[PDB]
Amino acid sequence: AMVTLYTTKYCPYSLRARIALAEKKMSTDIVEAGDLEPAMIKKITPNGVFPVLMEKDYSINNRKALLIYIDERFPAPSLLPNVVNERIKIRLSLDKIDNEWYPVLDQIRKHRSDQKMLESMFKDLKESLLAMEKAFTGSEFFISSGFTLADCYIAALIICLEAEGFIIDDEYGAIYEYKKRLFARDSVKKANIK
């Protein structure tokens, strides 16, 4: 009731924010936009960018800054590794996921009407995942001991790729096990139901 997150359906930035807020056990309440008038929508976020986290008179919708703000605004439990060197590599992974993997989801959405262009995009995305299957071996979550923001980034990316028709199944190996572990977690599956 104190803080409110305004979300959009099928948006990975909205999904990974709900996963992160749930991991924080914050008293914030989710409010699905689209159910609100443009008079309210244009007042929530002036530039119409979702998701939007607001409390009091502050309001943040910057994509690359939202979850970092979430983890710092509600500090416990920490969503970054405690060891400095692991945290530095997680920060680089977050930048690589936002700049090199989320655009793959973006182009799959934009050209989903073209079946032949879609089949090739799914084919290149499978080869990309299978190439880094070794990086998912020997860790309960993504290259870390515990649940981090990277697991939030990846979960929302898998949920949205699943809706587009891209499924991670038995053939991905350690990636598939990590996915099964990832979706077993309460915050991920609370946001995955639809």
Partner: protein, 202 residues
């Protein structure tokens, strides 16, 4: 154990070198453009996808994007604090840093390409002149806000630092700073006269 891969006249390299200087860190600065350090150049393309400059490398990691490097330096050297103290201000500092990078920093880099058209280079310069003063005023305001929230605290305002090199490379690239405001001119001269900045540009 910490190594910083560097290129001459790279504005990202000069920013990071001034940051490492303030935090009291002692990293090995390697100008990769020089022929003597060509053995390090071979090492860089191994640990980075595109021989990224600059790159902060230790025995454990190798990071290369400016926002990531600044965040990593803040983990390795907490003193003095890099960002503001409150979370909304810290988020605002990261949004503004993303903006200064998109419109100024990587356009300063594009102007160093050798195959640029005259009209192309002039549009890049004119577009930065269009927003430089407006950007500088936001940085001063956001710096005055954080000072109000914490007078005792003394963090290195990283945006004021980065904007100092924007002005320095403005001067290097013969781009004029479009303002007749004698106060703004007085402050830009004072930014360029900070001792840590003077030590960085040799």
């Amino acid at each position: 154990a910490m190594l910083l891969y560097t290129k001459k006249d790279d504005i990202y390299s000069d920013i990071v070198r001034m940051i490492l200087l303030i935090k009291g860190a002692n990293a090995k600065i390697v100008d990769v453009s020089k022929e003597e350090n060509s053995k390090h150049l071979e090492e860089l393309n191994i640990i980075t996808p595109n021989g990224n400059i600059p790159t902060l490398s230790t025995d454990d990691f190798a990071v290369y994007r400016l926002s990531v490097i600044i965040e990593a330096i803040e983990d390795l050297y907490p003193f003095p604090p890099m960002f503001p103290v409150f979370p909304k201000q810290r988020a605002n500092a990261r949004i503004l840093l993303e903006y200064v990078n998109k419109t100024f920093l990587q356009n300063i880099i594009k102007l160093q390409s050798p195959d640029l058209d005259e009209k192309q280079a002039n549009e890049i310069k004119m577009l930065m002149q269009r927003d430089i003063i407006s950007t500088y005023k936001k940085i001063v305001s956001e710096r005055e806000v954080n000072a109000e929230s914490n007078p005792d605290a003394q963090n290195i305002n990283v945006l004021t630092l980065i904007i100092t090199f924007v002005f320095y490379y403005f001067i290097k690239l013969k781009i004029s700073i479009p303002t007749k405001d004698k106060n703004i001119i007085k402050e830009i001269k004072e930014l360029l006269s900070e001792p840590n900045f003077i030590k960085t540009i040799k």
